[PDB]
């Protein structure tokens, strides 16, 4: 009927498939449904607020930068030129790592190079 390789392939396929592995549908009572809706809506609102806060902050930073650069242009042309360069190949430093869940054994390195 089937080889051992064929069997193993079938098993692998099954791992991915939804055939006889999935539970019943999540039914709710009307009160429960409402509670869920209120949870979700509130959360969504909170997320929107956070986005606006961050977005606003970014806008503020941009405005400050603009204000700075105009001033620099007014005062010292060479300094302005130096500031406003193409940073095409700018690379973030490899020490600035993505913050983990829990910290390492040695928290901070005081010596380098």
């Amino acid at each position: 009927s089937l080889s051992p390789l064929a069997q193993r392939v079938v098993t692998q396929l099954s791992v991915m498939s939804a055939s006889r592995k999935q539970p019943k549908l999540l039914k709710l009572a009307r009160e429960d449904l409402i509670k869920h809706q209120t949870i979700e809506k509130c959360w969504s609102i909170y997320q929107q607020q956070q986005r606006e806060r961050r977005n606003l902050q970014l806008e503020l930073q941009y405005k400050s930068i603009e204000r700075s650069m105009n001033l620099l242009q007014e005062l010292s042309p060479r300094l302005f030129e130096a500031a406003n360069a193409s940073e095409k190949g700018k690379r973030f430093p490899m020490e600035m790592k993505v913050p983990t869940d829990f910290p390492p054994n040695t928290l901070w390195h005081y010596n380098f190079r």
Binding site: R54, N55, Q57, L58, Y62, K88, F92, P99
Partner: protein, 274 residues
């Protein structure tokens, strides 16, 4: 059929009739997939995404600061040129195609608080070419992909036909999977931390790699996939293993911006940039 003449009749009102809602056929389908009452419901925002949080906090501001060019105006792309009306044959003529390209190119905007580059989507294209002989290899590749991602893969089929390579048309051959949001972020984090350091002579992603507009890519060999923790934990269960292409799609206007963004997430870049 009395005729094939298609011709949509005009209306006498501005109300937008959603025809789906007027039926009683698919009552489960009227609910959005986000809604709890739909069978299509899935808990989306299950836990705090770490890479995304990092981007929000540290990187995004830094990226904005980098990309500020003073009084930078919009750079319009190559577009379809209109004809000068110096002849009456120009009068209903289609426009001249773009200068260099056949297809139109997008406008490059200055980076401000709104349009800072960020990760949009990852796609993991795995086309196993031995599966022209063995269909079961495609299945195994798909499983591997699923294991790696925690996301449902989609089967790739042979779209073309060719004699030199023993390839038919309409044959299942490997799989793909578009990761988005938190799963994608996790996958990137795993790539940065676990897998790519275990590759021996790994210099990084090439600086000559990428789209013209905010898309960067690279690929992993069959040797490299055994470093993924889901595959590594049962090497008996994974005798064969398949390479893959990894298309990273950013919200970057240009490719150097996208590269910079990826560097922020601890991706090394080695080659001479364009």
């Amino acid at each position: 059929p009395k005729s094939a003449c298609s011709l949509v009749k005009p209306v006498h009102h501005l109300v937008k009739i959603d025809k789906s809602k007027l039926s009683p056929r698919f009552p489960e389908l009227k609910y959005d997939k986000s809604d709890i009452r739909s069978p299509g419901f899935k808990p989306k925002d299950t836990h705090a995404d770490r890479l995304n949080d990092h981007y929000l906090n540290t990187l995004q501001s830094d990226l904005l600061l980098i990309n500020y060019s003073h009084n930078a105006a919009v750079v319009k792309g190559l577009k379809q040129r209109a004809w000068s009306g110096d002849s009456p044959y120009h009068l209903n003529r289609p426009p001249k195609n773009p200068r260099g390209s056949k297809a139109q190119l997008p406008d490059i905007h200055p980076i401000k608080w709104s349009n800072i580059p960020g990760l949009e989507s990852v796609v993991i294209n795995c086309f196993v070419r031995e599966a022209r002989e063995n269909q079961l290899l495609a299945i195994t590749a798909a499983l591997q992909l699923q294991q790696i991602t925690g996301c449902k893969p989609h089967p790739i089929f042979s779209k073309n036909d060719v004699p030199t390579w023993k390839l038919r048309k309409g044959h299942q051959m490997g799989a793909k999977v578009e990761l988005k949001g938190k799963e994608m972020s996790q996958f990137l984090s795993t790539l940065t931390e676990i897998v790519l350091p275990r590759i021996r002579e790994y210099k990084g992603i090439s600086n000559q790699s990428g789209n013209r507009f905010g898309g960067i890519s690279f690929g992993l060999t069959a040797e490299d996939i055994k470093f993924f923790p889901e595959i590594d934990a049962n090497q008996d269960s994974w005798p064969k293993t398949f390479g893959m292409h990894i298309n990273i799609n950013t919200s970057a206007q240009l490719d150097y911006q996208a590269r910079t963004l990826l560097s922020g997430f601890q991706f090394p870049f080695f080659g001479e940039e364009k």
